[PDB]
Amino acid sequence: TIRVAINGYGRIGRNILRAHYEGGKSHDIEIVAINDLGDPKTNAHLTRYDTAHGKFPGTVSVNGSYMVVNGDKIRVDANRNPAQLPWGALKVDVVLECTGFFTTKEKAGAHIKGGAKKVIISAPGGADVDATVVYGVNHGTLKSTDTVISNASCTTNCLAPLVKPLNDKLGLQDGLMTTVHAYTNNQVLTDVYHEDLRRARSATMSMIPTKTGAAAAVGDVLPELDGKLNGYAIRVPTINVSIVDLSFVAKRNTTVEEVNGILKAASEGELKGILDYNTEPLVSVDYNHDPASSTVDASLTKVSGRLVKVSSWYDNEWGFSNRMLDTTVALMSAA
Amino acid sequence: TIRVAINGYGRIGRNILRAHYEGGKSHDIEIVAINDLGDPKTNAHLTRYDTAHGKFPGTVSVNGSYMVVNGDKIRVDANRNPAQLPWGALKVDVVLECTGFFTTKEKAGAHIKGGAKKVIISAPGGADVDATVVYGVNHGTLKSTDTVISNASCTTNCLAPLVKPLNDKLGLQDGLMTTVHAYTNNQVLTDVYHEDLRRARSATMSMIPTKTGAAAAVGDVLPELDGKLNGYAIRVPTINVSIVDLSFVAKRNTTVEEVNGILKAASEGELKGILDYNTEPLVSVDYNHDPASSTVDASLTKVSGRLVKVSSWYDNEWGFSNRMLDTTVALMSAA
Amino acid sequence: TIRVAINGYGRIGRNILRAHYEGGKSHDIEIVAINDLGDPKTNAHLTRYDTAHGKFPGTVSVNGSYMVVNGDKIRVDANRNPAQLPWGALKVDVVLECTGFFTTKEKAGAHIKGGAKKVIISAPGGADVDATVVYGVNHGTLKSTDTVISNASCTTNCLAPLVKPLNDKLGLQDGLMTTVHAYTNNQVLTDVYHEDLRRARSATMSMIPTKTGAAAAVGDVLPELDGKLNGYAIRVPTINVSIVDLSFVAKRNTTVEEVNGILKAASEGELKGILDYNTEPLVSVDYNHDPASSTVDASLTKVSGRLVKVSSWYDNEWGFSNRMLDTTVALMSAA
Amino acid sequence: TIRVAINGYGRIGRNILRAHYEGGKSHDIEIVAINDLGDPKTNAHLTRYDTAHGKFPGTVSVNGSYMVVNGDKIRVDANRNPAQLPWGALKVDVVLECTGFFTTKEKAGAHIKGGAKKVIISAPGGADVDATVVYGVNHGTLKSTDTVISNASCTTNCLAPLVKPLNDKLGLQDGLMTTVHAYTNNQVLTDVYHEDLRRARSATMSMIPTKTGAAAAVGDVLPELDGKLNGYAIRVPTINVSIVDLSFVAKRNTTVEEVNGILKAASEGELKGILDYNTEPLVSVDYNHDPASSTVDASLTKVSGRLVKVSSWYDNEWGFSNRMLDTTVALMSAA
Ligand SMILES: [K+]
Ligand SMILES: [K+]
Ligand SMILES: [K+]
Ligand SMILES: [K+]
């Protein structure tokens, strides 16, 4: 069994915990501790009830210094400095680092002082991390000696599984992405100070362009495409679920039928359970609580010369939460 | 002075009337009559007050068989058959056909039997129309012999002013558009029967892919690009304002600086007052009630090899409304 | 077993069918036929997928002249005239009349000429109906001779279970209700002609006062309160779930503790399964897909002298849907 | 001239500045300084453009240590501790305290150490404040010796002008209020930690009950009604504009016509420019940017016995912003 602790019990941390229990604990992982500065009773209530993901089907109680989930006792801690946390005493294998304040190997190193063996950052990492992984695409690069890695971003986890089979079988010369994306808690209800002058504007009333590193990051996970992809995001008024719209130049002449056929074979083979393929006339809400990293909408595929457009749906919370569990097992199983 | 009547006083007709009066009657036009089947007191109320476009800054009174706007008496009629309308007796030069029921020349010709000289359809027309016009791009195609024309669509009026200068000064091999678009009254509040199984789903809770012919229609306006463009729409939860996202393959090597430079020059020259150019960090609500057909957002332009992305904002109601007035003048001035 | 047909397969009809199957067919009822003018493949699609109520957990197939739900074959018809429908040949006991076009006994009686035994209208009925029922409150008024009845409205089914115990155990002199209510498809996305000048305005951007007869209608269900209640609705930007806010004058001195105690006792006794009682800090989305007619929010109760405020949550679609099944059984069991 | 400084240039502070300039500087006030910790260029941009209130009609520049509005140079400061601000050197008469961190006379006293003469808190104050004022209702209580006062809340400023003429002419025994209220930046986009377990829930998807002190606070401004009013708020998915729904027991028998007549005479007399009276079929958006404290919607008035319901619209940002200017003049003019 792999012993995990969660640092930061915000949305990402809660959704990782719910994905573990709702899926019947199918990974050989036990969550043994959570560190968060909030009231444990408040954090238990937000585990039981959610707007986007509905009611948790199991049981949650607070009992002394523990939160008890489906009978499992999870130790609740509250310290700002990971060097002071009892990770060694609790025999923690992997800390899932979910606060956003420890995104370099230098900073995530504090968990190592606390006594944990390894760390997975739930976000893009600095240049000093040991690896950046999209599960299903490059988790094979991991080594038993890696100690701090990044699980990339929600958007990179949708785009990379799309790009890999297309580059392998057809060839991608250049590509430009737009992600039409749900709002997040980094945004605002009504206009107020923000570091990003566009995100300072009401998220509920507008389409809001914003930067994304996801297209450039595909170069970290597929080095053969470094520098060949770029793009941006448009934040729109929905609570959850997003879509990648990828336009690319193919290395040879092709058709809608060939492009869709490549993606379909990949969803049934090397990328089964990560990349899905759909032909039904669905809308974004139908993908809420869908655990896939990427689902191709086959009806939207277009080809004009060597210019191709493909589109893929993703639950930007739930896909990524499930992959954090997969990457945990891969990291601890690496030779 | 050109005497104008409006057939159909829904959102399109009311917005044309409001654009005429709010802009200070800048066009040498008088609106002399409106035909509509609804209660004139309800239609006056919806002229005074709107959610998207706010309160009309002038005055509106009902007085017998007239609606009086800023002192001008406008005759109100109610007849389903255009051949029976008194266009001849009221000396109507141009009918703006806004009902959606008369979109071919064979059907719209009924207005001419009623006594009008010319008809402009506020939508894409049938294969039998005399012309399809995007004002600023191809209004010079118009002839004094033309009697029934189309003003194209809101999306075609955003896209064609972008592609004209880019094709002229650089060259377009192939292109694919996504328009991220505000919902309209063809959609639904909560799921219910619809001819389109995606538009049958709540407009307020999802991103909803749907077809549009606007990219292909650029071929009617710019014959040199016929067959080289295609695209689709994604409907999202906003009440008004949309964005065109165009990905295209250039005919030679280029840069972000050159692409933006071509667009800025066109905005200051031949397309002044139709294509605008913006470098500020704005969001969709800032373009509400902006009368431009197309505003390039210069900060969003990307280039990867010969693959280029350009993005342009449009008020999908107000830009089109103002162009209907411009096209009226062009039709009556044509040699 | 009671054989049931549904006339009108809009949101009301689909939600009745879904309540029957999702609850495990708890009522001794079989749905044998549906009459509707729309394409059966579209109606099957909208059964499988909904925005407000999510994905149907079972299976739906179209197969000739049948829609097959969890293996049960349901005959699909399409005829505007109920007298021409084969209710006699299919041995239909009760027709649930859900089109909105047959709300008097004189009109709904056409189903009986078609061969059905009984009709229940899914809305307030005309002055000629045999009864108006809020299940749990007055279903004991029903007689074996009754043939066409009304199930009242969604709002009346929330209000009447509150006022019955309060009048019985304390006494109500006078009362005034505001229901703060989710939008419906009678409203609009952006302003356009409507018979009601307030509902002509965008539902997504405003609070919109509108009339309702639901408070006065309590007099049909509880004759002792006839003339003592009135009220109105405020429509707000949510897709589903509403709240009744009732202010009333008690017939004697009282306290918050006594008022809440009366309601809690009723929820555990005579109104069990119809009126619920909640003390948790929840919000409207938590009551989506809750089948209760009325849930008292105990934390909100206020008393100032003899003036009392009580507030109650209701899923305006799902509570009513489940009550239609309860009322079907009561009608066929009446002595 | 009264010399004013603004402490906190959030929404309340910006809207006070805009109300001064947009109204043509009709009060004899000059804004001489702003203290805020943000980038002055960002704060200037948010003065030029707003989602709810649209574009500022004037000019705004940043020039060294000043923000220049319509030609007026306003000194920009940035210090957390008001004791260290140069209010004395700048000869400040009144600080408009808009941060939410100085809501007691004890804390607001730091501005007095800085050298300012007086302070008005833009919010409910602690028990130690010299006065709590609703302009038009009780500004007559102010004395030349008062140094720290409260302008009450947005909701108290709507409710008090409603209650005063009704209590004066008819008599109010007891009253209970519900305010159906726009969301604010204290709330969240998607569920996240909050001190209030209901405000921790997405503001865009739900009706959210929450506490309000506004009804009890009417007792501070009209001591004859202390203890006779109570109520709560329901936050709903709109960006701005709210409504007070007041239910009360009148001291004698009355009618709809009498109640409306009392309110109409008050809007034309003692409360002119503070309480307005409307008979048109309007919705919340039509009241955006309306400077009144309270506008009675006469069509909504109901009477059942001695039980009365009256409803009043308020722009919860703009009404209050304009009253802050009125209260400033009253405070400095007091004998
Ligand atoms: K934020
Ligand atoms: K529709
Ligand atoms: K409608
Ligand atoms: K907040």
Q: What structural domains does chain D harbor? A: 1-152+317-334 (3.40.50.720), 153-316 (3.30.360.10)
Rounded to the nearest 10 degrees, what angle do helices B154-169 and B214-221 cross at?
60
Helices assigned H by DSSP within B23-135: 40-48, 105-108, 110-113
Q: For residues D110 and D108, give the distance between their C-alpha atoms in angstroms, rounded to a whole number.
A: 5
Q: For residues D244 and D313, give the distance between their C-alpha atoms in angstroms, rounded to a whole number.
A: 7
Q: Beta partners for B132? A: B150
Q: For residues C174 and B168, give the distance between their C-alpha atoms in angstroms, rounded to a whole number.
A: 76
Report the SS3 class of residue C32: strand
Side-chain-facing half-sphere of A15: CA atoms under 13 Å = 27
Q: Exposed e or buried b for every residue in D271-282, given b needs 16+ CB within 10 A?
A: beebbbbbeebb
E strand residue ranges, chain B:
2-7, 29-35, 60-63, 66-69, 72-77, 94-97, 118-121, 131-132, 148-150, 172-182, 208-210, 229-236, 242-250, 275-278, 294-297, 302-304, 307-314
Rounded to the nearest 10 degrees, what angle do helices D11-22 and D40-48 cross at?
50
| A30 burial via Cβ count (<10 Å: 0-12, 13-18, 19+) | middle
**B190 touching chain D per CB within 8 A:** no
E strand residue ranges, chain D:
2-7, 29-35, 49-50, 54-55, 60-63, 66-69, 72-77, 94-97, 118-121, 131-132, 148-150, 172-182, 208-211, 229-236, 242-250, 275-278, 294-297, 302-304, 307-314
Rounded to the nearest 10 degrees, what angle do helices A318-333 and A11-22 cross at?
70
Cα C188 to ligand 3 centroid, rounded to whole Å? 5
| Residue C97, phi then psi, degrees to nearest 5 | -90, 105
* Nearest Cα residue to A181 out of A11, A320, A313: A313
Q: For residues B231 and A26, give the distance between their C-alpha atoms in angstroms, rounded to a whole number.
A: 42
Q: For residues C182 and C234, give the distance between their C-alpha atoms in angstroms, rounded to a whole number.
A: 9
Q: For residues C189 and B208, give the distance between their C-alpha atoms in angstroms, rounded to a whole number.
A: 15
Radius of gyration, alpha carbons of chain C: 20
Side-chain-facing half-sphere of B178: CA atoms under 13 Å = 27
Contact C51, C24 (CB under 8 A): no
* Nearest Cα residue to D313 out of D297, D301, D291, D289: D297
Torsion sign (Cα): C253, C258, C259, C265: negative
Q: Beta partners for D178? A: D232, D245
Cα D123 to ligand 4 centroid, rounded to whole Å? 18
| Residue D100, phi then psi, degrees to nearest 5 | 75, 0
Q: Beta partners for B2? A: B29
A197 closest CB neighbour out of D45, D183, D206 = D45
* Nearest Cα residue to D122 out of D4, D288, D252: D4
Contact B47, B16 (CB under 8 A): no
* Nearest Cα residue to A298 out of A266, A332, A325, A251: A266
Q: For residues A118 and A101, give the distance between their C-alpha atoms in angstroms, rounded to a whole number.
A: 17
* Nearest Cα residue to C37 out of C16, C66, C10: C10
Tokens of A301: 């595929």
Question: Which residues in chain A have Cβ-Cβ distances shorter than 8 Å to C282?
Answer: 49
Q: For residues A157 and A180, give the distance between their C-alpha atoms in angstroms, rounded to a whole number.
A: 15
Q: For residues B274 and D263, give the distance between their C-alpha atoms in angstroms, rounded to a whole number.
A: 51
| Residue A109, phi then psi, degrees to nearest 5 | -55, -25
Q: For residues C52 and C58, give the distance between their C-alpha atoms in angstroms, rounded to a whole number.
A: 17
SS3 readout for A66-92: EEEECCEEEEEECCCCHHHCCCCCCCC
* Nearest Cα residue to B103 out of B84, B80, B119: B119
Catalytic residue among C19, C154, C158, C225: C154
Contact A189, D187 (CB under 8 A): yes
Residues 6+ apart with CB under 8 A from D239: A189, A190, A202, A204, A205, D51, D52, D182, D183
| Residue B19, phi then psi, degrees to nearest 5 | -60, -40
Q: How many other C-beta atoms lie within 10 A of the C-beta of residue A216?
A: 15
Q: For residues A102 and A82, give the distance between their C-alpha atoms in angstroms, rounded to a whole number.
A: 10
Degrees, nearest 5: CA angle A149-A154-A157: 75
Degrees, nearest 5: CA angle B202-B206-B210: 85
DSSP labels, A124-149: PPPTTSSEE--TTTSGGG--TT--EE
* Nearest Cα residue to B214 out of B225, B199, B198, B204: B225
Say which amino acid occupies D72.
Answer: D
Residue with tokens 């809750």: C290
Determine, for residues B207 and A305 on separate chains, whether the beta-carbon distance falls below 8 Å. no
Residues 6+ apart with CB under 8 A from A281: A299, B197, B198, C45
Residues 6+ apart with CB under 8 A from D63: D73
Q: For residues C195 and C187, give the distance between their C-alpha atoms in angstroms, rounded to a whole number.
A: 11
Tokens of D150: 């409260």
Active site residues of B: 154
Q: For residues C8 and C6, give the distance between their C-alpha atoms in angstroms, rounded to a whole number.
A: 6
**B100 touching chain A per CB within 8 A:** no
Active site residues of A: 154
| Residue A131, phi then psi, degrees to nearest 5 | -165, 160
- Residue A15, CA distances (Å) to A12, A47, A52, C306, D203 in order: 5, 9, 11, 48, 20
- Residue B303, CA distances (Å) to A164, A174, A228, B163 in order: 21, 9, 10, 16
Give me the resolution in angstroms, 1 decimal: 1.7
Q: For residues D28 and D333, give the distance between their C-alpha atoms in angstroms, rounded to a whole number.
A: 11
Instruction: Name the structure determination technique.
Output: X-ray
* Nearest Cα residue to C15 out of C71, C44, C53: C53
- Residue D168, CA distances (Å) to A35, B31, D172 in order: 58, 53, 9
Residues 6+ apart with CB under 8 A from C111: C7, C82, C85, C87, C95, C97, C102, C119
> Among this protein's residues, is D154 annotated catalytic?
yes
Q: For residues C199 and C181, give the distance between their C-alpha atoms in angstroms, rounded to a whole number.
A: 13
Q: For residues D217 and D220, give the distance between their C-alpha atoms in angstroms, rounded to a whole number.
A: 5
**D286 touching chain B per CB within 8 A:** yes
Helices assigned H by DSSP within chain A: 11-22, 40-48, 105-114, 154-169, 214-221, 256-267, 318-333
Cα A186 to ligand 1 centroid, rounded to whole Å? 4
Taking the CA atoms of residue A211, residue A212, residue A215 and residue A220 in that order, the dihedral angle to the nearest 10 degrees is 130
Tokens of A91: 């025999």
Q: For residues C43 and C46, give the distance between their C-alpha atoms in angstroms, rounded to a whole number.
A: 5
Report the SS3 class of residue A263: helix
* Nearest Cα residue to A183 out of A216, A151, A158, A206: A206
Contact A247, B247 (CB under 8 A): yes
* Nearest Cα residue to A68 out of A34, A37, A39, A27: A34
Side-chain-facing half-sphere of B270: CA atoms under 13 Å = 14
**D190 touching chain C per CB within 8 A:** no
* Nearest Cα residue to D34 out of D108, D70, D107, D86: D86
Q: For residues B195 and C39, give the distance between their C-alpha atoms in angstroms, rounded to a whole number.
A: 9
Tokens of C96: 């649930």
Q: For residues C3 and D206, give the distance between their C-alpha atoms in angstroms, rounded to a whole number.
A: 38
**A50 touching chain D per CB within 8 A:** yes
| Residue C84, phi then psi, degrees to nearest 5 | -90, -5
* Nearest Cα residue to C260 out of C296, C313, C307: C296
How many residues are recorded in chain A?
Answer: 335
